[PDB]
Amino acid sequence: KRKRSRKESYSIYVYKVLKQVHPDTGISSKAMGIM
DNA sequence: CGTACGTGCGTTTAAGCGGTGCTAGAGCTGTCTACGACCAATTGAGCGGCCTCGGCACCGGGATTGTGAAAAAAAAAAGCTGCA
Ligand SMILES: [Ca+2]
Ligand SMILES: [Ca+2]
Ligand SMILES: [Ca+2]
Ligand SMILES: [Ca+2]
């Protein structure tokens, strides 16, 4: 087909900050949208 | 029904005005280079795609908490007295 066009986001940085602050805590897709 | 506000006086206060005198600092000019744009080549961070397995949604069952009804007490409340 085509590979879907590139959509930048902050979500890898949010996940990295979350793992410093709450190592045993994750985040729903919506939550990450809000972030 | 109780009194906080609005009105209207006389007394007091300091804003406003116009002026002067002093200089902090706003803002302008000219110089020079540290810093940011631009570029080309390099490459690794982050993208999409994909797979998985554990959190969490949902369920049923039981424990727990809170509500309302009725009956019965506690209490204020009300109408009812003669006196003074
Ligand atoms: Ca912490
Ligand atoms: Ca009152
Ligand atoms: Ca100056
Ligand atoms: Ca991904």
Which chain B nucleotides are covered by protein, judged by CB under 7 A? Answer: 46-49, 55-56
Which residues have CB under 8 Å from A15's CB, separation 6+?
A27
Task: Give the closest residue to A32 by CA, choosing from A18, A12, A13, A11.
Answer: A11
Output the CA torsion A20→A22→A8→A34 (10° steps). Answer: -140
Query: How far apart are the CA of A25 and the centre of ligand 1, in A?
Result: 11
SS3 sequence, chain A? CCCCCCCCCCHHHHHHHHHHHCCCCCCCHHHHHHC
A6 touches strand B (CB under 7 A): yes
**Contact of A32 with A16, CB cutoff 8 Å:** no
CA distance A18 to A10: 12
Solved how?
Answer: X-ray
Residue A26 φ/ψ region, left for φ over 0, alpha for ψ in the -120 to 50 degree band, beta for the rest? beta
Resolution value in angstroms:
2.7
In the block, which residue shows the tokens 């590979």? Answer: A3
Angstrom distance, A15 CA to B18 C1': 69
Interatomic separation, CA of residue A7 and C1' of nucleotide B62, rounded (Å): 50
Q: Cα separations (Å) of A9 from A1, A24, A27, A34?
A: 24, 23, 15, 11
